[PDB]
Design a protein around this ligand. Structure first.
Ligand SMILES: Nc1nc2c(ncn2[C@@H]2O[C@@H]3COP(=O)(O)O[C@H]4[C@@H](O)[C@H](n5cnc6c(=O)[nH]c(N)nc65)O[C@@H]4COP(=O)(O)O[C@H]3[C@H]2O)c(=O)[nH]1
Ligand SMILES: Nc1nc2c(ncn2[C@@H]2O[C@@H]3COP(=O)(O)O[C@H]4[C@@H](O)[C@H](n5cnc6c(=O)[nH]c(N)nc65)O[C@@H]4COP(=O)(O)O[C@H]3[C@H]2O)c(=O)[nH]1
Ligand SMILES: Nc1nc2c(ncn2[C@@H]2O[C@@H]3COP(=O)(O)O[C@H]4[C@@H](O)[C@H](n5cnc6c(=O)[nH]c(N)nc65)O[C@@H]4COP(=O)(O)O[C@H]3[C@H]2O)c(=O)[nH]1
Ligand SMILES: Nc1nc2c(ncn2[C@@H]2O[C@@H]3COP(=O)(O)O[C@H]4[C@@H](O)[C@H](n5cnc6c(=O)[nH]c(N)nc65)O[C@@H]4COP(=O)(O)O[C@H]3[C@H]2O)c(=O)[nH]1
Ligand SMILES: Nc1ncnc2c1ncn2[C@@H]1O[C@H](COP(=O)(O)OP(=O)(O)OP(=O)(O)O)[C@@H](O)[C@H]1O
Ligand SMILES: Nc1ncnc2c1ncn2[C@@H]1O[C@H](COP(=O)(O)OP(=O)(O)OP(=O)(O)O)[C@@H](O)[C@H]1O
Ligand SMILES: [Mg+2]
Ligand SMILES: [Mg+2]
Lengths: 240, 168, 29, 240, 166, 29
């Protein structure tokens, strides 16, 4: 199925989890396609893509080229489609290009209908652009990424989550009383909370500096095993 | 010479943990069954688990994470077989809940248990009829053993070079 | 979907709601 | 002077630091106005403003009211101007209201010229809004907020920072090898990096749960003393 | 605090009131069981024009017991216990989180007994009106027109106001 | 942002970090 991963807030671990989950699903014998819908184009760097490599689906569309030629094969069962590098001019003027990318909405359904991939993972930003809402509409399921802090606790009450989304906890620390309090309150009040979480883990901080998914970088790391649990949970619950 | 994991299953089966190849699993449990210094019917519990249709045994095996030394598992014929050393039968669900990260009802659709020595031995007889071609291997072992055509070494570790390919 | 019914049953939640006014004002709403 | 605080990424501590810095400046004996320019309207919650209090400068402009009546006095030398609570529809459709916030540019220039405040701090979003660019142009100085991780390291090489901004480190942790490596590299390569940093402090996680700035919540916490050093540095270098 | 400066001056640390500071240093000077000229260094610091002494006082964070400071007459005065004059800049760098040259425009030092005592004489000529107090102490001694107690701690209540226009 | 990798190679700890983390080495050249 098509799985969207969107952070309730910036910098909660969405991109690292998306790459790690794609690697976990590929390791489980599934054909995976992972696409970067965030204009910062950071997902590619978790798969040893050269920083100077500017190609991507949104870059090819802004240049009139074929976005289907922007894909990259990581393993025999894991392909990725980067966003592409935007210039500083395009960065500071998103009015021009955020409406010229609706082709990917129709094109993803082609990949959805071909059956070549058992999983299509989408790294989604939390902006409210029309292309973000369209890609989220293509998703069959969603994961809202949070950390256990007061910021995310507020957001869970004042902003909207994707319909039917499940809440995934990341960066769970040891020895934080305020975290323990917020967590217990969530266990008793947050209905959509997943039955597994991801701890703070030096492997999760190091894998991006090694430009690899955490499962490839350190398969015996605790966060790698927790994300592998999430992968199996997706097989059991998100297959439809 | 003799394999280390086979040697342990011969002489010290209670020191094994984790995945064992089907035949090594059967030999380790049988050597526990015939150890005279172990209690009569208190060696442990043998459990056969059938995965739900939405998961394969190789995938469900990645969730089987025992910690007690002497707890071993194997896969073959779309069955995940566990042996929980010295686990009382009434405590089975406790031990199982410690081993899997998700509820075992959500992973497996059916379960069979043997705790008497004669019943465990009789099931070992049936398991040994399984052809070696039907014996499973863990996913990290078989997946990482496939040929990597986009590999490149940096002097210490292997890395993958992402290759351009047209999506069609 | 957030449900704040019967929070006080757990001992820790009652003390947590008293110590942190941010958590209390969302539970009392 | 008018000081803007903007994270190079979400969730790096920009709001908490903005509230802590406004508390330190008013405690140093300076008249301070702090302004929430982020649509998420979170800054107010660090000053014991009730969550159901929907008032704010942008909320007042969208409703036809006078934004000047949306101010809030916290101490004799610290005034607060929240953004205001947007509805879910407004959150999902920023183009409906982003262009209707023109008054705040001249309004802030008026507060600059009035001479009532020695410091006007602004909690700035990382979006590419035209209103966000206009508020950044009104700023005399700016602080770019980062965490020491691979994400921010990439961003410092691929995205633009405000002109003349200084880089402020937050959430500095103990016992992270990759953090030490990135930090040692920054010390020799990053030229806009501030001499002081802010460690990860439980007091900074709890103060928002207590709805207070960290300096008021726990004046003797390490992060409170680091923010206080930053406030004195602002007196020495950003004086205006 | 006053009895401490009388009998055990070396056990004091942190900010001391101007008169208590002078009495503590004088009691150290006249202690016969202390070394003849290794008692410490007296440092007077004039802040740069962009910062007031009470503000610069917030940056003065000694850690060694016996290091004390005071403010008065637009001067921050430190006594670094048993610090040798050669190691002055080392001790100062430990106490302030920023370079002292950026905080203070000028600095004077006395490290010999006779010099320290003569400087104490001049310091005591200063009228009490010029004696400073720490900013957190004075800012806390101000009234609070919007306080509210929650049963354990004082909390501030933000009051609606109008940002005036002209 | 002004970044100056003038003499990163000379510092000892930076050499080992650039050789362990491909991401840091990538931007240093
Ligand atoms: N709740 C629970 N967890 C279990 C059980 N069996 C194993 N574990 C978990 O698995 C870890 C490894 O167990 P081990 O190899 O038997 O190795 C154990 C075992 O040899 C011994 N040990 C610990 N507690 C007991 C105990 O209560 N009785 C006995 N007889 N030995 C114990 O110390 C070793 C290290 O112990 P731990 O740090 O606790 O680490 C244990 C514990 O985390 C069990 O029946 N219940
Ligand atoms: N093979 C196997 N059997 C398991 C496992 N977890 C539980 N059991 C079985 O379930 C019984 C009850 O487990 P419990 O509630 O954790 O209750 C345990 C636990 O609270 C404690 N305990 C015993 N051994 C350990 C250990 O190694 N580590 C820890 N942390 N606790 C232990 O003592 C209690 C009584 O232990 P027992 O008489 O041994 O009885 C255990 C054992 O027969 C497992 O991972 N593997
Ligand atoms: N770099 C540096 N830091 C200084 C110096 N003097 C004081 N400090 C700092 O201030 C703290 C308290 O100093 P203290 O009152 O002399 O209190 C000290 C002192 O009474 C004693 N102590 C510790 N190290 C030494 C030492 O090397 N020599 C002596 N004679 N006493 C020491 O233990 C107490 C606690 O020590 P710490 O945990 O180290 O904590 C020390 C240290 O963090 C100094 O000359 N150099
Ligand atoms: N009043 C005052 N004087 C200060 C302070 N920091 C440094 N000094 C003076 O400068 C000398 C050299 O300091 P250092 O480089 O930290 O070098 C120190 C430091 O490395 C160590 N040391 C001594 N006492 C302590 C202590 O209490 N804690 C720690 N952590 N180290 C200490 O021994 C070295 C030689 O110590 P000393 O003979 O005491 O000599 C010290 C002392 O005379 C300070 O905070 N307050
Ligand atoms: N569980 C974790 N433990 C330690 N470090 C982590 C963990 N999760 C993420 N990180 C690190 O935190 C940083 C930010 O993570 P990441 O890029 O995945 O978040 P994000 O929400 O996608 O960010 P952005 O808002 O920029 O899109 C990275 O350096 C990453 O390695
Ligand atoms: N130094 C710190 N140590 C510990 N927790 C911290 C620290 N700085 C911030 N936090 C906590 O991290 C969370 C996020 O901080 P904050 O809201 O200030 O970040 P931000 O950059 O404004 O995020 P946003 O994207 O929502 O605007 C809060 O719960 C805050 O209490
Ligand atoms: Mg991201
Ligand atoms: Mg913010």
């Amino acid at each position: 199925a098509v799985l969207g991963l969107q952070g309730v807030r910036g910098g909660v671990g969405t991109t690292t989890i998306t790459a790690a989950l794609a690697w976990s699903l590929q390791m489980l014998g599934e054909n995976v396609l992972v696409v970067d819908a965030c204009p910062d184009n950071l997902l590619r760097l978790s798969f040893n893509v050269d920083f100077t490599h500017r190609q991507g689906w949104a870059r090819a569309m802004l240049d009139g080229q074929d976005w289907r030629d922007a894909g990259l094969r990581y393993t025999s069962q894991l392909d990725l489609l980067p966003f592409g590098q935007l210039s500083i001019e395009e960065q500071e003027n998103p009015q021009h290009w955020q409406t010229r990318l609706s082709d990917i909405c129709s094109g993803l359904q082609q990949l959805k209908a071909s059956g070549r991939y058992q999983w299509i993972l989408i790294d989604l930003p939390r902006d409210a652009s029309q292309i973000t809402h369209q890609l989220l509409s293509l998703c069959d399921h969603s994961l809202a990424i949070v950390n256990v802090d007061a910021n995310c606790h507020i957001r869970l009450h004042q902003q909207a989550l994707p319909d039917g989304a499940h809440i995934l906890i990341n960066n769970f620390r040891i020895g934080s009383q305020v975290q323990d309090d917020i967590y217990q309150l969530w266990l008793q009040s947050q209905r959509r909370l997943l039955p597994m979480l991801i701890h703070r883990d030096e492997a999760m901080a190091e894998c991006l500096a090694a430009k690899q998914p955490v499962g490839e970088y350190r398969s015996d790391a605790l966060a790698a095993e927790e994300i592998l649990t999430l992968a199996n949970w997706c097989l059991l619950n998100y297959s439809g | 010479m003799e394999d280390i994991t086979t040697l342990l299953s011969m002489t010290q089966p209670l020191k094994l943990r984790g995945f064992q190849k089907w035949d090594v699993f059967c030999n380790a449990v049988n050597n526990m069954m015939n150890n005279p210094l172990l209690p009569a019917h208190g060696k442990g519990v043998l459990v056969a688990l059938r995965p739900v249709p939405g998961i394969r045994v190789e995938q469900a095996l990645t969730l089987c994470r025992p910690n007690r030394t002497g707890d071993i598992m194997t896969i073959g014929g779309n069955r995940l077989v566990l042996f929980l050393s010295f686990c009382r039968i009434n405590d089975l669900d406790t031990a199982l809940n410690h081993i899997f990260p998700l509820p075992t009802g959500d992973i497996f659709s059916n379960r069979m248990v043997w705790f008497e020595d004669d019943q465990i031995s009789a099931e070992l007889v049936q398991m040994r009829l399984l052809a070696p071609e039907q014996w499973g291997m863990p996913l990290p072992l078989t997946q990482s053993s496939k040929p990597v055509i986009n590999a490149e070494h940096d002097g210490r570790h292997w890395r993958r070079i992402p290759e351009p390919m047209r999506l069609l | 979907d957030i449900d704040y019914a019967d929070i006080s049953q757990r001992e820790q939640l009652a003390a947590a709601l008293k110590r942190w006014p941010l958590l209390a004002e969302f539970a009392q709403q």
